[PDB]
Amino acid sequence: RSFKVTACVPSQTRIRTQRELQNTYFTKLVPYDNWFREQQRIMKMGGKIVKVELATGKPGTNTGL
């Protein structure tokens, strides 16, 4: 099972000559067990997430992963 996250985050410490639109806005597929850590990493830079509906589906199941 996996999620479809999208989120926006800036960087604070520097001004960058490269474009970084894919770095300031995401639409990523992240699995279930990385998401306990991947969500917390955007909190340290303070970026907001918006739409976090799961794409793999089948919620509330017990077995079958």
Partner: protein, 160 residues
Amino acid sequence: SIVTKSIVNADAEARYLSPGELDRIKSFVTSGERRVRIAETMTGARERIIKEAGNQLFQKRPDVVSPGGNAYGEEMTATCLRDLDYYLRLITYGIVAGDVTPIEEIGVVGVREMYKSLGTPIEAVAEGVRAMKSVATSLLSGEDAAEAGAYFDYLIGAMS
């Protein structure tokens, strides 16, 4: 099960599965008719196993039987007696499944942080299912007990 344990292994290397796996899946289905015989032995024994082994862990460990333990009380001795009903009814799915992928995700994954939050000794239930293992080999005919008893041995070696 042994399909889905192997199917996710074939997908991770992105290929059609091995002929080494083809002798695995063929022997599982052709021995499945005696595999369902092991599950229905646990149907009529589902009060017989848990009545002896919960008292057997109480005499293997009389730490729990005194006031100050963790099963102590008619809702508290019924806590571990019911959780031993769960772990029996857990792995009887995994006899006929033939591997550990039903038992491990809904039984084994979050345990150590749970039992320290619940205050229960992990060494108690580790030797408690060891008491559940020994009577399971008796009522079955040896070899079919030996293929189903290893899932008990998976459950012993994965708590601690």
